[PDB]
C-alpha cells in the first residue's frame, strides 16, 4: 500500500531531468571548443555525450570508425557523414589531454544519471501499475504519479471531490 | 542619457545594413550577429519583433573610424549586406564585428592583422562570428594568405602605416574585383607629421590614382577625431 515511493520518484525524476540538462550543456561547451559543430549537428544532448565519448579527437577519422559512429543513432539524419567531413574541416582548437580527460569523464557522468533516470522511470511505471493500476492505466504512470504528489497521498486524492481533482 | 533600458525607436539608415535609434539622443546601431553579448562592452538594444527577441549593438563613432564616417555623411559605402569585404588592419573586433554585422550571415569579412597580441583577441571574436575569417599575417605581402582569401567586393584599410598605399595596391590588385570598392582611413601623423594635414591627404590621392583607383569622395572625421580623413574610391582595372 505504500505510495511514498512514487512521490519520491517524481520529485527525483524531474530533478534528474533538469540536472541531466545542466551537466550535458556544459559538456557541449567543453567539447565545443575542440570542435563546436557537433553541438550543432546532434542537438539531442544525450546522444551528444556518447559521440564525444567515442569521438574524443576529431582527427581520428576512419571508415570503420565512421561505421561505428554510424551505428550510434542512425544515418538517416546523415550526421555520421557530416561529422567525418566536418571533423576534417573545422576551426576547433585542440585542448589538452587533461582537458580531454575531463570531458569524457564529465560526459560519462551525464550518461550515468540519464541511464539511472531511465531505470528510475521504469521503476515508477512498475510501481504505479502495482499501487494504482486503475489510475495508471486510465491516464498514465507519469501523469498519475504527479497527481498523487500534488494531493500529497493516494488517500488524499480519493478523498478529494471531482472538482477539486480537476483543479489539482 | 542612453541607459540600457531606455526605450528607443529603431529605423533603417540610408545605407543598407545600418540602423538608427531615435530618442532624446541619436545613436547609430547595427544588428547583432551574435545576440546576447557585447564584443567590447558597447551598449546593446533589445527589440521584441513578432515574439522573437532580436538584439542590436551600438556603434561608437569615437572608437570606430567607419562609424564616424557614417555620421559625417559618406555618400557611398561599398560595405553592405551580402558582400565580401577585405578588412585590413584588423587590430581587434571593435570595428570588424560591426562590419561583420553589416555584411550579415551571407557576407564574409577577411580580417587581416600582423601584431600577435591584438591577433589572439581577434581570434577569440571570430569564434562567435562564423563569417569572420581572421588572417594574422602581414598585409605588405598578400601572397602569404592568398590561399585563404577569395574575392572581395570592397577593401577596407585602417592601417596606420607610412606605406599603406603600397599595401592597398597589392591587396586590391590581388583580391578586389573590377569596379570594386576601396575605402581608406588616413592618418596624417603616421605618414608624415612634418607637413600639414591637407598636404598628406592630397599625396595619398595621387598614389591612389597612380594605382588605377579613382577617388569618389573625401571626408574629414572631425569633431570625433583630429587630422583624419576617409577616402572612398573605385577600382577600374581598365
Amino acid at each position: 500500500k505504500n505510495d511514498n515511493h512514487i512521490i519520491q520518484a517524481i520529485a527525483l525524476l524531474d530533478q534528474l531531468d533538469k540536472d541531466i540538462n545542466t551537466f550535458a550543456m556544459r559538456v557541449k561547451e567543453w567539447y565545443g571548443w575542440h570542435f563546436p559543430e557537433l553541438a550543432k549537428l546532434v542537438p539531442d544532448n544525450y546522444t551528444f555525450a556518447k559521440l564525444v565519448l567515442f569521438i574524443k579527437d576529431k582527427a581520428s577519422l576512419n571508415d570503420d570508425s565512421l561505421h561505428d559512429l554510424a551505428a550510434l543513432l542512425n544515418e538517416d539524419s546523415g550526421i555520421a557523414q557530416r561529422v567525418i567531413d566536418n571533423a576534417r574541416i573545422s576551426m576547433g582548437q585542440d585542448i589538452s589531454e587533461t582537458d580531454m580527460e575531463n570531458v569524457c569523464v564529465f560526459a560519462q557522468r551525464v550518461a550515468s544519471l540519464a541511464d539511472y533516470r531511465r531505470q528510475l522511470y521504469d521503476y515508477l511505471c512498475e510501481k504505479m501499475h502495482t499501487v494504482a493500476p486503475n489510475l495508471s492505466e486510465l491516464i498514465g504512470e507519469v501523469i498519475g504519479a504527479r497527481l498523487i504528489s500534488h494531493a500529497g497521498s493516494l488517500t488524499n486524492l480519493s478523498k478529494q471531490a471531482a472538482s477539486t481533482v480537476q483543479i489539482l | 542619457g542612453a541607459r540600457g533600458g531606455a526605450k528607443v525607436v529603431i529605423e533603417p539608415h540610408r545605407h543598407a545594413g545600418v540602423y538608427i535609434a531615435r530618442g532624446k539622443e541619436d545613436l547609430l546601431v547595427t544588428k547583432n550577429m551574435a545576440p546576447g553579448e557585447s564584443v567590447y562592452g558597447e551598449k546593446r538594444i533589445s527589440v521584441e519583433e513578432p515574439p522573437t527577441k532580436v538584439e542590436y549593438r551600438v556603434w561608437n563613432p569615437f572608437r570606430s573610424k567607419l562609424a564616424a564616417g557614417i555620421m559625417g555623411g559618406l555618400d557611398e559605402l561599398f560595405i553592405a549586406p551580402g558582400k565580401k569585404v577585405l578588412y585590413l588592419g584588423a587590430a581587434s573586433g571593435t570595428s570588424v564585428s560591426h562590419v561583420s554585422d553589416v555584411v550579415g550571415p551571407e557576407g564574409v569579412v577577411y580580417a587581416v592583422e600582423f601584431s600577435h597580441r591584438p591577433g589572439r583577441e581577434l581570434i577569440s571574436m571570430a569564434k562567435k562570428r562564423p563569417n569572420i575569417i581572421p588572417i594574422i599575417e602581414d598585409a605588405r605581402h598578400p601572397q602569404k594568405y592568398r590561399m585563404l582569401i577569395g574575392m572581395v567586393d570592397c577593401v577596407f584599410a585602417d592601417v596606420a602605416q607610412p606605406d599603406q598605399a603600397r599595401i592597398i595596391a597589392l591587396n586590391s590588385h590581388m583580391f578586389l574585383k573590377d569596379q570594386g570598392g576601396v575605402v581608406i582611413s588616413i592618418k596624417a601623423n603616421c605618414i608624415d607629421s612634418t607637413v600639414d594635414a591637407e598636404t598628406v591627404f592630397a599625396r595619398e590621392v595621387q598614389k591612389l590614382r597612380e594605382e588605377r583607383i579613382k577617388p569618389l569622395e573625401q571626408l574629414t572625421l572631425e569633431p570625433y577625431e583630429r587630422d583624419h580623413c576617409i577616402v572612398v574610391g573605385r577600382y577600374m582595372r581598365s
Binding site: 582527427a59 539511472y116 | 564574409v108 581570434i123 594574422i136 602569404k144 590561399m147
Partner: protein, 403 residues
C-alpha cells in the same frame, strides 16, 4: 604546355592552360571574366587534397616559407611526362623553389599571371566540382585558426577560460550533490530514519547504504572503513531498534543506484578540484601563492578573463565581490565595504579586528602586481616567484601590524 599552380585551403590544384603563353596576352581580363571561358581555358591536371588539418597546416607553412612540399612535389612529378612545358606560379619564391627541383618546367611568375590567378579566384567553387563555397570558407576559417595558434605560440596549458568554466562547474556540482544527498537521506530515511543524525557526511551516508542494504544486514556487515568504531556501533544498535519500515528489493536497487551516484559525484568533485588547482598553478602561479586557488578562481571568473582582471585597479579587486554592499553604502551616505571576495583568503583570516581591512588593501595591491605578471608576461616561468616575495611582504606587514 602552360601549367598554373593554384593553392587552396583544401589542397593543391594544377590547371592545364591551352595557350603556352596565356600569361603574355594583354586581354586576360576580358578572356577570363566568366566561369565558362575559365573552364575552357583551364582544365584540372591533378588535384592533391589535404587529408587532415595537421597535413593542411604543414602544407600551409611550407607555402608561406616558399618551400615545395612533398605533396606538391609528387603532384608536380605526375605532369613531368609533358616535355617543354611552362609552369605559371603565383609567388616568385615558390617559382624559384620549384625551379631548383630540376623539373622540366619553365616556371613563370609575372605580373600578367596575376590576372590568371585573379580570374581563377572569382570562380573557385564553380571551377572545383564537389566543394561548395560555404564548405570552402570552413576550410578557410579552420586552417586560419590552426595556422594562427602556432604563429601566436598558443599553448593548450595557458588558457584561463578553463578556469572560468571549472570553478562554475564546481559550484553547480556542489549545489546538486547536496540536493541528491537530501533526497537519499529522505528516501533511505524511510527504511531507517536514524542514520542522518548519526552520520552527517553525505558521502559516508551513501556508502553505508552500499555496504549494507537492509537493517537485518547490519548485524554482520562491517562499517569500519566508512565509520570509526564509536559511530559504526551506534548505527548497528539503531538498526535493530530502528523505526524505518521494510522495503522491497526493487526499492532497494534504485536507492543503491542513488548511493552509487552520491559517492560517484564526490569522486569527480575531488577530481575537478585537483584538475582546477593544476590549471591555476600553470595559468596564474603567482596568485595561487598569494591569494590561493579557490579565491583566485572566483576573482578571475568574476571579471570574466585574466586580462580583464589584470587591467582593473587594486581598489576594485579589494571590493570585487561586494557590489551589493558597496552600492548600498554609496547611495545611503554610509560606510563602504573593505573585504569583498578576498575576505575568505587565508591572510585575511590570520588578521584580526581592524587589521583585516588593512591587510585586504595590502593584499589586494600585491594581488594586482602578481596578476599583471601572470596575464601579460610572454615568457613567464611557471614558478610563482613574484607571488612568493609578494606573499612575504604581506606576511611581514601582518606581523608588524599585529605586533
Amino acid at each position: 604546355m602552360a601549367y598554373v599552380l593554384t593553392e587552396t585551403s583544401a589542397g593543391y590544384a594544377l590547371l592545364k592552360a591551352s595557350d603556352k603563353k596565356i600569361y603574355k596576352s594583354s586581354s586576360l581580363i576580358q578572356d577570363l571574366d566568366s566561369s565558362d571561358k575559365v573552364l575552357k581555358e583551364f582544365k584540372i591536371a591533378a588535384f592533391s587534397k589535404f587529408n587532415s588539418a595537421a597535413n593542411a597546416l604543414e602544407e600551409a607553412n611550407s607555402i608561406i616559407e616558399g618551400k615545395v612540399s612533398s605533396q606538391l612535389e609528387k603532384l608536380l612529378e605526375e605532369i613531368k611526362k609533358d616535355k617543354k612545358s611552362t609552369l605559371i606560379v603565383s609567388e616568385t619564391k615558390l617559382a624559384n623553389a620549384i625551379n631548383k627541383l630540376g623539373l622540366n618546367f619553365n616556371v613563370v611568375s609575372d605580373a600578367v599571371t596575376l590576372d590568371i590567378y585573379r580570374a581563377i579566384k572569382e570562380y573557385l567553387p564553380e571551377l572545383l566540382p564537389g566543394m561548395s563555397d560555404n564548405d570552402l570558407s570552413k576550410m578557410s576559417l579552420g586552417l586560419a585558426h590552426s595556422i594562427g595558434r602556432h604563429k601566436l605560440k598558443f599553448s593548450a596549458d595557458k588558457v584561463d577560460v578553463m578556469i572560468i568554466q571549472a570553478i562554475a562547474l564546481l559550484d553547480d556540482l556542489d549545489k546538486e550533490l547536496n540536493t541528491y544527498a537530501m533526497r537519499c537521506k529522505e528516501w533511505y530515511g524511510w527504511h531507517f530514519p536514524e542514520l542522518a543524525k548519526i552520520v552527517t557526511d553525505s558521502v559516508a551516508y551513501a556508502r553505508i547504504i552500499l555496504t549494507m542494504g537492509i537493517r537485518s544486514k547490519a548485524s554482520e556487515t562491517d562499517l569500519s572503513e566508512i565509520l570509526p568504531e564509536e559511530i559504526e556501533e551506534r548505527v548497528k544498535t539503531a538498526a535493530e531498534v530502528s523505526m524505518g519500515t521494510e522495503i522491497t528489493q526493487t526499492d532497494l536497487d534504485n536507492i543503491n543506484a542513488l548511493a552509487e551516484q552520491i559517492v560517484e559525484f564526490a569522486a569527480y568533485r575531488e577530481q575537478l578540484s585537483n584538475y582546477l588547482s593544476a590549471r591555476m598553478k600553470a595559468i596564474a602561479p603567482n596568485l595561487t601563492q598569494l591569494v590561493g586557488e579557490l579565491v583566485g578562481a572566483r576573482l578571475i571568473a568574476h571579471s570574466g578573463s585574466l586580462i580583464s582582471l589584470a587591467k582593473s585597479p587594486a581598489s576594485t579587486i579589494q571590493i570585487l565581490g561586494a557590489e551589493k554592499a558597496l552600492f548600498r553604502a554609496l547611495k545611503t551616505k554610509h560606510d563602504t565595504p573593505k573585504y569583498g571576495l578576498l575576505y575568505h583568503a587565508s591572510l585575511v583570516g590570520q588578521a584580526t579586528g581592524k587589521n583585516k581591512g588593512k591587510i585586504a588593501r595590502v593584499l589586494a595591491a600585491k594581488a594586482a602586481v602578481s596578476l599583471r605578471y601572470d596575464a601579460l608576461a610572454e615568457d613567464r616561468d611557471d614558478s610563482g616567484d613574484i607571488g612568493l616575495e609578494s606573499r612575504a611582504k604581506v606576511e611581514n606587514r601582518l606581523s608588524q601590524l599585529e605586533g
